[PDB]
Amino acid sequence: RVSSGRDLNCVPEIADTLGAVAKQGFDFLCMPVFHPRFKREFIQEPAKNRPGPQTRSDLLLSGRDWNTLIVGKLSPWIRPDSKVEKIRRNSEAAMLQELNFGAYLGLPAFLLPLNQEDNTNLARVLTNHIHTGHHSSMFWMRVPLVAPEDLRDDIIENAPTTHTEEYSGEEKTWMWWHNFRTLCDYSKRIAVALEIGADLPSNHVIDRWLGEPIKAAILPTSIFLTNKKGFPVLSKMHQRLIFRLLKLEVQFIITGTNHHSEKEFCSYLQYLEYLSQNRPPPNAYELFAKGYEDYLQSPLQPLMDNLESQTYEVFEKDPIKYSQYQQAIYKCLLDRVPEEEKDTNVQVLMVLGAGRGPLVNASLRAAKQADRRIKLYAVEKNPNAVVTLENWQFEEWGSQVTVVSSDMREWVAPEKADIIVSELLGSFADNELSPECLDGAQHFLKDDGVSIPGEYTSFLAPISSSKLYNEVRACREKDRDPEAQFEMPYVVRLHNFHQLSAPQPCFTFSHPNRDPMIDNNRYCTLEFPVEVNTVLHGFAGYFETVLYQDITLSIRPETHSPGMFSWFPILFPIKQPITVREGQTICVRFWRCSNSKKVWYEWAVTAPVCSAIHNPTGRSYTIGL
Amino acid sequence: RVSSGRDLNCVPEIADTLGAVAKQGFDFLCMPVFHPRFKREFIQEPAKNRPGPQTRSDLLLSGRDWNTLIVGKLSPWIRPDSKVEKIRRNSEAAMLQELNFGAYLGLPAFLLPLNQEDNTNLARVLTNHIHTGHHSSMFWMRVPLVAPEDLRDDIIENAPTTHTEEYSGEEKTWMWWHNFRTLCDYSKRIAVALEIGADLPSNHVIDRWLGEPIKAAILPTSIFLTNKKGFPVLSKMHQRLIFRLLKLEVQFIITGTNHHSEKEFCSYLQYLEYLSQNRPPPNAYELFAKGYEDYLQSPLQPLMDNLESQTYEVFEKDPIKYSQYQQAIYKCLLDRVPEEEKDTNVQVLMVLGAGRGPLVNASLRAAKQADRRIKLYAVEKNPNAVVTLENWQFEEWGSQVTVVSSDMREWVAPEKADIIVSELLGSFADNELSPECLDGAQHFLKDDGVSIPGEYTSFLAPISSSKLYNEVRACREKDRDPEAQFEMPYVVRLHNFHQLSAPQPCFTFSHPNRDPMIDNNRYCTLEFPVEVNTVLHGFAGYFETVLYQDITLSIRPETHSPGMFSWFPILFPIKQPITVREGQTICVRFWRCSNSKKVWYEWAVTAPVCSAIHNPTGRSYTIGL
Ligand SMILES: O=C(NCc1ccc(F)cc1)[C@@H]1c2ccccc2C(=O)N1Cc1cc2ncccc2[nH]1
Ligand SMILES: O=C(NCc1ccc(F)cc1)[C@@H]1c2ccccc2C(=O)N1Cc1cc2ncccc2[nH]1
Numbered sequence A, B: 001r002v003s004s005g006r007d008l009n010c011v012p013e014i015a016d017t018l019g020a021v022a023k024q025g026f027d028f029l030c031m032p033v034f035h036p037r038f039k040r041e042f043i044q045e046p047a048k049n050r051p052g053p054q055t056r057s058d059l060l061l062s063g064r065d066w067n068t069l070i071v072g073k074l075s076p077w078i079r080p081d082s083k084v085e086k087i088r089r090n091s092e093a094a095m096l097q098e099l100n101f102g103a104y105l106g107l108p109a110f111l112l113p114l115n116q117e118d119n120t121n122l123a124r125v126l127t128n129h130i131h132t133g134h135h136s137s138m139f140w141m142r143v144p145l146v147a148p149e150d151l152r153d154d155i156i157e158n159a160p161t162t163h164t165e166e167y168s169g170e171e172k173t174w175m176w177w178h179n180f181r182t183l184c185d186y187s188k189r190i191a192v193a194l195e196i197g198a199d200l201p202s203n204h205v206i207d208r209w210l211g212e213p214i215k216a217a218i219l220p221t222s223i224f225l226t227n228k229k230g231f232p233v234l235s236k237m238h239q240r241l242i243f244r245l246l247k248l249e250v251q252f253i254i255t256g257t258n259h260h261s262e263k264e265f266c267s268y269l270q271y272l273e274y275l276s277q278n279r280p281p282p283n284a285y286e287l288f289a290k291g292y293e294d295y296l297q298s299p300l301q302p303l304m305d306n307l308e309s310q311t312y313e314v315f316e317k318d319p320i321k322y323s324q325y326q327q328a329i330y331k332c333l334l335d336r337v338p339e340e341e342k343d344t345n346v347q348v349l350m351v352l353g354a355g356r357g358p359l360v361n362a363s364l365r366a367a368k369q370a371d372r373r374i375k376l377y378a379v380e381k382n383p384n385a386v387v388t389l390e391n392w393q394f395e396e397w398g399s400q401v402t403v404v405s406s407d408m409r410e411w412v413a414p415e416k417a418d419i420i421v422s423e424l425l426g427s428f429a430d431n432e433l434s435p436e437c438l439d440g441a442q443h444f445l446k447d448d449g450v451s452i453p454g455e456y457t458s459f460l461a462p463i464s465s466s467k468l469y470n471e472v473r474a475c476r477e478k479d480r481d482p483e484a485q486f487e488m489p490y491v492v493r494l495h496n497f498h499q500l501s502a503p504q505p506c507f508t509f510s511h512p513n514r515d516p517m518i519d520n521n522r523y524c525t526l527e528f529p530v531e532v533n534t535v536l537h538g539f540a541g542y543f544e545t546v547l548y549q550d551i552t553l554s555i556r557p558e559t560h561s562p563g564m565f566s567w568f569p570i571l572f573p574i575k576q577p578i579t580v581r582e583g584q585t586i587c588v589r590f591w592r593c594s595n596s597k598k599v600w601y602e603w604a605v606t607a608p609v610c611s612a613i614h615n616p617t618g619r620s621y622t623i624g625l
């Protein structure tokens, strides 16, 4: 169930070593390419002219074995950031040699340590290697939760351990990582191998690593406790961490000797498997969403575009949503028609944007459970969907449903409606121009008429995700602005990220709109209190909607409708990441803009530092009217 | 074994129709989306306001069934290129409607006819649809081998059939296709469904379709003969055509009613299967190459780049090549050392570019079968490969082989060689700078010394491939010249192409070179007699090499070494396709250019029309010294 590897720094026979590792259930082996102690000279004679082979032969394994089962390791003597110029130059040449041999073998990954603050020259050499030749090999930066200096024993008489709470100082290993990857310009080839220590740090120090590209989690054998049976186990503190890591789907590496000598080495792995099986199983959301983690998708535009059959199909596959619509209409019918007027009053319902007719069906179910009379119109502009409606209407519905093939903003209604029902909401509520459409359909609502939904609100929350930032970056395309990808929202199941502050309401719309000169343009300033250090990369967007009274739908995490999986979150990126210190406020500004042809969003960060205004005049992103 | 479909123009029940088609062994079904006779008005009242559903519901099949099993068809009444303005405008609206419904359903393909010369407005509407929304749906242009007017029966009294040999006129259906796809600007979404007739045309008319994107081959039931048993079969003429088509891996569509009424409809398909099984099986080349058909790859540069382990691995997997090297060295040893000097004379061999040591081994085998003494040097610049050599040398070879880790152009030899052996040849012979390397290694050859290979020649041949042209086109990348992809060669297993003329020698090199001021720059003019009409898209490159005397290696099709699969052909594209009439000569000019840092090729067509000079100053492509 869980993908696991073995870290060794001693391999006397490469073929024999693998066999043992494989027999114990491990999937891969982290090991050296050159002997860790085999220090090499490249400048000074005579040692530079050392004869013989420099390492093992590539022939000792199959190409496939190298490609899938071996993870390389930089030699421990290689120190590119040494103060001694000789050691620097030698380590440079050695690092390139080892990396080049890694590429030669076609290794899937290669481990490099981050065990100090200054890794500038290390970064400079790695970046040079990445921009030389072609390879898909990953680089896993071995970085500890807690620096070695900060988890040493307090056994030096004239050098006591820091017994002071240093909030920023305890987060120092993240800053080592942050600086390294910034120097390397967020290479997608560079990821984290997070080394877990005996004493876990404070919670903030761990939360630091949320939204970071963690590919591996190194577990020393030393951190394992022993149970009554006499086999390796972990603390409740470490258990919760592994449970969190299992959600990120990282690969667990075991390092160090067998301290549980009486038992096998598989026992360590068996415990991780034990934890893997013993977790809360995926709900309807997590089961279905499984696969779309941090996958960027363009926001749907049902007005501008005609949605395909299989786009409507997946919408209809959300029974929670339509049961809510059914219940909303059911309640509205009872409120509008009393018991004494049950069979005198026929309510005129109008589904505005009927699609393949999930609402029409719900409107029929609602009227039947309420026991009230209704007259349905099914307005739909998409002519491909109208084919479905009319086939259904002829076969099933009948003359009670009048299928209209038109734009709701154009349609000349032969009758005014008591209720209008619509499903024109996206991930950011008004991102499908629901305001504009329902404003133009407002005229054929009765003066006392109802709209379902009656209200909707969009929410924003600042996020830190070096993964998602790096994902957006990669959406650069030919023949357009080099930074257009940062000035447009994305529908994405947010997974590897950190929500820096609680969501706050951005834009609200009420239907029917009774404010003279109905203006759908908006400008909203939000101040987000941040209680951690972090790197803002964008803003997660959510929404809530009031269908009728107490019947609502929501994708806001704290009020999320349970089971519903129709709407994924939206993401508004920023061009450049922004540093945020603990105590500082992130201040974002959001505009909703429009002309006669388009609607779009602009946005800007104003605190703690200013960003550029994103998407001015909808240059990078517009929503078609 | 063979992928087959069924063409119907009558589907009374879509669910029932599929079942029957599936039961007969067909993989998919070509069928209408709207009723073929259901003509629709879009302008004039009252018929434009026709009520009811316009076609069947998308719900009648599953999303997956639409996506994999159904191929759409344009309605027969739709004529976008009609002379009547009303019919034009109506057919425009109808064509878009049908295409849009195709996309809605998510059909993998959609058939449109090319049954006349002028399909300009048809092309204009299709191109508009392709550049609207997003879809991966293919468009199969139904185009006959022989136009309907040219295979009609000679039964009109006052209108006799053309009994004149019209070379250009018999190729008219290709010109219909050519014009259509040119208007549509070689869209990768547009392909050919080639309709086979009762009477096949002349051979030239068929050869016309070589190098065209044929995705389907439509076979009417009418073209099938009947055997003694009373079951459908084809002529020997059609058999050879199907055998040719099976190499292209097209999908065979059966159209028309069952003329073999007494038998099942599966019999037609069973015959295609019968042919599929009864073909010449793939040789060592075609077996291994299977997968790389028309796949563009960058030419390897072993000098500039250090080749990976698995790149050397695949080279070593060609036993025919090294057996030839073994035999070449074997012969040279016998010529250089007489029988009386068997154990007095030790020949100094030097493998220049030893890799992981396939030649060294061959040199050992050669000396053993010859029974002569040798002293080996193994010069190799790639330090990753030198690791393999030294491990081998310590374990197996010993002190007889002296592994040198150096550039051959730099290495100061402690002894002059009797033989130098090299493997520095690419697909175009000198494309790996074998001349430059062996020139710089020439000094440590004895005055009477031998080089293996002693000579090599490159060959060129003009080709027509709308597939390969369209493939190169797609290699456009960000942040470089928009047409850089056309000014660089590609290693490609040429499959869907047409060789327009016989290969001719381009560049030749001899080693050792004894011409004063050894200049490796070249300029070659080639005139290729073309005996067909066609569209030149580039130049296939091959090579031959003389290892010693009569021992050779070759990838030139007519003298190809049997079994050898180390070198694929090279392709030099041109920016713009060039029309060539039958009888005209294609005149190409090739330069080999260099400075102190780089070597590159430039090329230009001068007849029948001029092209631009490709790759001036190696702007788009250089080979690193
Ligand atoms: O967020 C989304 N769905 C989440 C999802 C869940 C499971 C799965 F397998 C794939 C995707 C869709 C969507 C999908 C793909 C690409 C874009 C989008 C998008 O803007 N959505 C929001 C959305 C749903 C919807 N329903 C009706 C009317 C308007 C609507 N607007
Ligand atoms: O043409 C080529 N090989 C054909 C091939 C066959 C089977 C297969 F599965 C994949 C590829 C290689 C090649 C492969 C890939 C990408 C580029 C090339 C290329 O320039 N080649 C020519 C070549 C072979 C070679 N051997 C030794 C010294 C110099 C050499 N130069």
Ligand SMILES: CSC[C@H]1O[C@@H](n2cnc3c(N)ncnc32)[C@H](O)[C@@H]1O
Pocket: A302, A303, A306, A307, A315, A352, A353, A354, A355, A356, A379, A380, A381, A382, A385, A406, A407, A408, A409, A423, A424, A437
């Ligand atoms: C169920 S997703 C929203 C649906 O409403 C439809 N729709 C959106 N805008 C309009 C409009 N202005 N008039 C009619 N239908 C619309 C879309 O085509 C889609 O079927």
Ligand SMILES: CSC[C@H]1O[C@@H](n2cnc3c(N)ncnc32)[C@H](O)[C@@H]1O
Pocket: B302, B303, B306, B307, B315, B352, B353, B354, B355, B356, B379, B380, B381, B382, B385, B406, B407, B408, B409, B423, B424, B437
């Ligand atoms: C077998 S592919 C050609 C081999 O020759 C090697 N080679 C190419 N040019 C030189 C050179 N100038 N000196 C030494 N080896 C070379 C390459 O590194 C490769 O291993």
